[PDB]
Design a protein around this motif. Sequence first.
Motif, mmCIF file in Angstrom:
data_model
loop_
_atom_site.group_PDB
_atom_site.id
_atom_site.type_symbol
_atom_site.label_atom_id
_atom_site.label_comp_id
_atom_site.label_asym_id
_atom_site.label_seq_id
_atom_site.Cartn_x
_atom_site.Cartn_y
_atom_site.Cartn_z
ATOM 1 N N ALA A 202 0.838 -1.187 0.000
ATOM 2 C CA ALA A 202 0.000 0.000 0.000
ATOM 3 C C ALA A 202 0.881 1.247 0.000
ATOM 4 C CB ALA A 202 -0.934 0.002 1.210
ATOM 5 N N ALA A 203 0.296 2.364 -0.432
ATOM 6 C CA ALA A 203 1.026 3.624 -0.502
ATOM 7 C C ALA A 203 1.674 3.955 0.835
ATOM 8 C CB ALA A 203 0.084 4.751 -0.927
ATOM 9 N N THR A 204 2.961 4.292 0.790
ATOM 10 C CA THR A 204 3.724 4.504 2.013
ATOM 11 C C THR A 204 3.152 5.669 2.813
ATOM 12 O OG1 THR A 204 5.963 4.759 2.908
ATOM 13 C CG2 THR A 204 5.410 6.047 0.936
ATOM 14 N N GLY A 205 3.091 5.491 4.131
ATOM 15 C CA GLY A 205 2.730 6.583 5.008
ATOM 16 C C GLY A 205 1.246 6.844 5.087
ATOM 17 N N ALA A 206 0.420 5.862 4.730
ATOM 18 C CA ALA A 206 -1.026 6.005 4.733
ATOM 19 C C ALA A 206 -1.657 4.792 5.400
ATOM 20 C CB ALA A 206 -1.579 6.168 3.311
ATOM 21 N N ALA A 207 -2.823 5.010 5.998
ATOM 22 C CA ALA A 207 -3.537 3.922 6.644
ATOM 23 C C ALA A 207 -4.046 2.913 5.617
ATOM 24 C CB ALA A 207 -4.715 4.473 7.445
ATOM 25 N N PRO A 208 -4.024 1.619 5.943
ATOM 26 C CA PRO A 208 -4.442 0.605 4.967
ATOM 27 C C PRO A 208 -5.889 0.817 4.546
ATOM 28 C CG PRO A 208 -3.535 -0.418 6.964
ATOM 29 C CD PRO A 208 -3.640 1.042 7.241
ATOM 30 N N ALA A 209 -6.172 0.521 3.283
ATOM 31 C CA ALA A 209 -7.504 0.721 2.736
ATOM 32 C C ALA A 209 -8.315 -0.565 2.818
ATOM 33 C CB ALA A 209 -7.426 1.197 1.285
ATOM 34 N N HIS A 210 -9.579 -0.442 3.221
ATOM 35 C CA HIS A 210 -10.548 -1.512 3.036
ATOM 36 C C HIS A 210 -11.285 -1.405 1.701
ATOM 37 C CE1 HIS A 210 -12.706 1.824 4.881
ATOM 38 N NE2 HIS A 210 -13.840 1.302 4.451
ATOM 39 N N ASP A 211 -10.757 -0.614 0.767
ATOM 40 C CA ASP A 211 -11.204 -0.616 -0.621
ATOM 41 C C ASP A 211 -11.186 -2.029 -1.197
ATOM 42 O OD1 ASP A 211 -11.610 -0.381 -3.367
ATOM 43 O OD2 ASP A 211 -9.959 1.011 -3.703
ATOM 44 N N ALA A 212 -12.157 -2.303 -2.077
ATOM 45 C CA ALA A 212 -12.241 -3.601 -2.746
ATOM 46 C C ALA A 212 -10.940 -3.960 -3.451
ATOM 47 C CB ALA A 212 -13.400 -3.602 -3.743
ATOM 48 N N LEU A 213 -10.215 -2.954 -3.947
ATOM 49 C CA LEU A 213 -8.923 -3.196 -4.579
ATOM 50 C C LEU A 213 -7.933 -3.770 -3.573
ATOM 51 C CD1 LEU A 213 -6.938 -3.115 -6.839
ATOM 52 C CD2 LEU A 213 -6.717 -0.638 -6.575
ATOM 53 N N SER A 214 -7.960 -3.266 -2.341
ATOM 54 C CA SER A 214 -7.156 -3.845 -1.271
ATOM 55 C C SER A 214 -7.756 -5.150 -0.759
ATOM 56 C CB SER A 214 -6.997 -2.842 -0.133
ATOM 57 O OG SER A 214 -6.194 -3.372 0.904
ATOM 58 N N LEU A 215 -9.085 -5.281 -0.792
ATOM 59 C CA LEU A 215 -9.718 -6.503 -0.312
ATOM 60 C C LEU A 215 -9.317 -7.699 -1.169
ATOM 61 C CD1 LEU A 215 -13.355 -5.727 0.896
ATOM 62 C CD2 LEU A 215 -11.257 -6.133 2.194
ATOM 63 N N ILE A 216 -9.262 -7.514 -2.490
ATOM 64 C CA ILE A 216 -8.927 -8.624 -3.379
ATOM 65 C C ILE A 216 -7.476 -9.052 -3.178
ATOM 66 C CG2 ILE A 216 -8.480 -7.012 -5.265
ATOM 67 C CD1 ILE A 216 -9.604 -9.391 -7.090
ATOM 68 N N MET A 217 -6.566 -8.093 -2.984
ATOM 69 C CA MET A 217 -5.172 -8.457 -2.752
ATOM 70 C C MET A 217 -4.993 -9.111 -1.388
ATOM 71 S SD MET A 217 -3.828 -6.252 -0.315
ATOM 72 C CE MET A 217 -2.077 -6.106 -0.638
ATOM 73 N N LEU A 218 -5.762 -8.688 -0.381
ATOM 74 C CA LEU A 218 -5.723 -9.379 0.905
ATOM 75 C C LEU A 218 -6.201 -10.820 0.761
ATOM 76 C CD1 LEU A 218 -6.924 -7.019 3.809
ATOM 77 C CD2 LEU A 218 -4.862 -8.427 3.727
ATOM 78 N N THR A 219 -7.268 -11.028 -0.011
ATOM 79 C CA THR A 219 -7.766 -12.378 -0.255
ATOM 80 C C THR A 219 -6.732 -13.220 -0.996
ATOM 81 O OG1 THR A 219 -10.070 -11.644 -0.253
ATOM 82 C CG2 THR A 219 -9.566 -13.710 -1.371
ATOM 83 N N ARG A 220 -6.055 -12.628 -1.982
ATOM 84 C CA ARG A 220 -5.018 -13.354 -2.710
ATOM 85 C C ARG A 220 -3.848 -13.712 -1.801
ATOM 86 N NH1 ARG A 220 -4.302 -10.083 -8.403
ATOM 87 N NH2 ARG A 220 -4.401 -8.382 -6.874
ATOM 88 N N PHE A 221 -3.472 -12.802 -0.901
ATOM 89 C CA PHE A 221 -2.417 -13.101 0.062
ATOM 90 C C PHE A 221 -2.821 -14.259 0.965
ATOM 91 C CE2 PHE A 221 -0.436 -12.640 4.182
ATOM 92 C CZ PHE A 221 0.900 -12.490 3.867
ATOM 93 N N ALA A 222 -4.068 -14.251 1.443
ATOM 94 C CA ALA A 222 -4.546 -15.348 2.278
ATOM 95 C C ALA A 222 -4.538 -16.665 1.513
ATOM 96 C CB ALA A 222 -5.949 -15.042 2.799
ATOM 97 N N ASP A 223 -4.942 -16.634 0.241
ATOM 98 C CA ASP A 223 -4.927 -17.845 -0.573
ATOM 99 C C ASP A 223 -3.507 -18.360 -0.773
ATOM 100 O OD1 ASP A 223 -7.705 -17.889 -0.855
ATOM 101 O OD2 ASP A 223 -7.647 -16.599 -2.628
ATOM 102 N N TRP A 224 -2.548 -17.457 -0.986
ATOM 103 C CA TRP A 224 -1.158 -17.880 -1.139
ATOM 104 C C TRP A 224 -0.616 -18.481 0.153
ATOM 105 C CZ3 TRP A 224 3.219 -14.873 0.865
ATOM 106 C CH2 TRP A 224 4.455 -15.448 0.546
#
Lengths: 146, 48, 146, 293
Positions: free
Chosen positions: D173-195
Amino acid sequence: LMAEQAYRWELNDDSARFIKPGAWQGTYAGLLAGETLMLSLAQMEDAHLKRDKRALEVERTVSLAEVYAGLPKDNGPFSLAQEIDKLVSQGSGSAGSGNNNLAFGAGTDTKTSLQASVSFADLKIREDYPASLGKIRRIKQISVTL
Amino acid sequence: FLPFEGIAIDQGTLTLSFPNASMPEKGKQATMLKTLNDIILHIRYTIK
Amino acid sequence: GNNNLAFGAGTDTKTSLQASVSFADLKIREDYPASLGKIRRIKQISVTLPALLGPYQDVQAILSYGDKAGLANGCEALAVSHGMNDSGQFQLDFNDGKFLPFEGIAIDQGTLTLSFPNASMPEKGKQATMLKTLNDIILHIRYTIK
Amino acid sequence: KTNLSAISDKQLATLIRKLNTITSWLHTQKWSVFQLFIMTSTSYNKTLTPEIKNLLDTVYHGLQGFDKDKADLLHVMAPYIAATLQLSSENVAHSVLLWADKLQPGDGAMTAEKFWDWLNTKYTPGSSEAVETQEHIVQYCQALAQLEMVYHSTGINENAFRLFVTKPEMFGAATGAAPAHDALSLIMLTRFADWVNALGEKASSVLAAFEANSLTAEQLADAMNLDANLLLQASIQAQNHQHLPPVTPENAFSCWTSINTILQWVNVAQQLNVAPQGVSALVGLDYIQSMKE
């Protein structure tokens, strides 16, 4: 809370309250209520023994005749010998002044009773020991001789 | 707790009463209280 | 040294007169052979003051230790009331869970100081006239060997 | 936010691709569009609920007498939040609270210190009263519950969720910013969990080596039962080619985005049944452009 009163008496910490409300919650049928109260008691005992120390136990003889002989001139000093024998003759009289006065009782069933009143502040007991020894002084027992 | 426990020395008033004192009422103490010379209190106080 | 007799130093003690005794100078350890016990500890301290105290009149004095650190809170000083085999407490009980004042204190090292408040006659101290009658002081050292 | 009436052709094509990818992802995840909207929602209903009221009562009773210097407010508040918001683990609630403090939910930006102060001063448990700040309190509680819905829906492990909350940069995620619960971040979180799930028993060591700057091509290849040379050369090819964000040897396995890019290279190579040099030769065939020869 009854133990709270005992702790706030044995230690002068009238401000310190340890039992808190909300230990019983009706949403959850009041479950765990006694374990919250038990934790409160454990904290109360921890603080109680944390704060307790052995106090200098002291005794002082107080001579009522000497004290009533000694109070300031405008308060009218008097030895009890010459007023006990005259107030018994007539109870309507009074002797002494302030809280160190010697006079008969006022309440309806006490008009015959004769009471001698002594003020603790006039007893000047606090200064008998240096203040560095202890900030607070409390009465533990009172014994009388006649 | 013994009677008069935790009472502060600095402030307070102590009153000792003798019922049936008045000889006009022939109080039981009247004759004996004439023999009373002096009073003593043994104050047991603690320092802490 | 530590056996000096002089008035108090702290701001509220200039009137008080304290007699200081060094435990090492008391040479108590050698009174028994070392084979009996390597360590010697104080279990209880009692003081006697054969002063010419009046009827219904009493001494007021406080003997205190020098360390005030190693020992349980408040066990470092006891105040004498009447001074005839008299400790700080009203009933002493060796079976009580409380450590008595001056318990576990090593005999070999240490300093014991007994203070008499309101000594100075220039300040008309309450003890002044009576302390003149004081001839000698006794300590009853209850110490155990183990 | 962008309007379809005034949009570029390339922007419209990008929008089409984004919609298709997200719809395919939702179909794979057995997720309704409404669930994704709830997980990605920012507006919060400002209405007191019995669940929120119970949360407030529990937090107020537990945190009563709390001392700021003695211990951290967030750590003390985490167990009661976990109990009230139906969480399996306490540290999950602690991570959610950290994430919420970084997000500052609601119309009145709310944080643990502000929430505790409001509860201490203006809250009377067991009574229904109107408070000016009470709507912001409700919004903060709803945000906390939503970040639970995030954690449970994603399926990520508790410690990698802690890492994601504390260091979004590790997840790219963009440095120096709070993590996003945006769907764009949600899909990458799901992919990380799957990996992580695919790594199996090795995941325990892989995640630990990832949280340190320790993970390498060879260790990850052993974890995924792949050839070490394959991952090394995929990383080399990713470094050679211009990705956005760029991939450099000091982040190629440190950041999750670089790892995802390397794994995408590996997936495309194995789809084509060729080495990553095969994909490198393929992507050179930009014959319909004027940027380069």
